[PDB]
Design a protein around this ligand. Structure first.
Ligand SMILES: O=C(c1ccc2ccccc2c1)[C@@H](c1cccc2ccccc12)P(=O)(O)O
Length: 223
């Protein structure tokens, strides 16, 4: 999270910490609790052995509130393109049901086809890198004004306004970055997007996954 500020310890229970460090490289990832035994994260944060941890703030410290539940099944989107980076969404069925508490509890998802007009004020969180020189052990966050699909349409190559979202204001040196991939973009207390990709420079706008479009699959997969 570039330009963001540290979140109030456990202010975001649904915030999950991905640890792909085992079956596919070793680079932390974001994710949010959508259900009791399901976590939503980018389809690229995949691994053959992911260890999710709920109810945390500082991953570099053994918090008694922390919940270390391994991923029993990391499902990727049937049409997740690796070249165009489309359908970048993945669900993680924990090996057990999280113990819902003030520190751990699912987040409300948006409705099908639920749009997100530009000018909206969203908030993204995650333990991602604050910069390309330093990182962070404690979950940080920042607000991102959703911009029109016009911008990202003249920046990124494979950008679909139907399944992707154009977030982040270029005029501001603040936005999701390396390590935030998977973190949800909550707008109106509703996880609307998922940090997909962006300019390797960390300079916004950036691309976010439109969850409201992958509802059918989301439900079908969990159900
Ligand atoms: O390289 C990445 C990257 C780079 C620049 C960024 C700029 C702004 C916002 C996010 C950005 C993310 C990701 C990443 C790592 C490793 C493999 C990936 C495969 C597909 C998509 C992302 C992947 P990440 O390590 O999962 O975080």
């Amino acid at each position: 999270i570039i330009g963001g500020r540290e979140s109030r310890p456990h202010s975001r229970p649904y915030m999950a910490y991905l640890q792909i460090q085992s079956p596919a490289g070793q680079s932390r990832c974001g994710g949010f609790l959508v259900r009791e035994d399901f976590v939503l994260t980018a389809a690229h944060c995949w691994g053959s052995n992911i260890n999710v941890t709920l109810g945390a703030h500082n991953i570099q410290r053994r918090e008694n509130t922390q919940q270390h539940i391994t991923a029993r099944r990391a499902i990727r989107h049937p049409q997740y393109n690796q070249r165009t980076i489309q359908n970048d969404i993945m669900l993680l069925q924990l090996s057990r049901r999280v113990r819902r508490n003030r520190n751990v509890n699912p987040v409300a998802l948006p409705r099908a086809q639920e749009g997100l007009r530009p000018g909206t004020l969203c908030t993204v969180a995650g333990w991602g890198r604050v910069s390309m020189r330093r990182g962070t052990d404690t979950l940080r966050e920042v607000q991102l004004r959703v911009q029109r699909d016009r911008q990202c349409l003249r920046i990124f190559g494979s950008y679909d306004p139907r399944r992707q979202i154009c977030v982040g204001d270029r005029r501001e040196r603040k936005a999701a970055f390396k390590g935030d991939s998977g973190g949800p973009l909550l707008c109106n207390n509703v996880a609307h997007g998922i940090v997909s990709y962006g300019k390797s420079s960390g300079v916004p706008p950036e691309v976010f996954t439109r969850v409201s479009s992958f509802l059918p699959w989301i439900r079908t997969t969990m159900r």
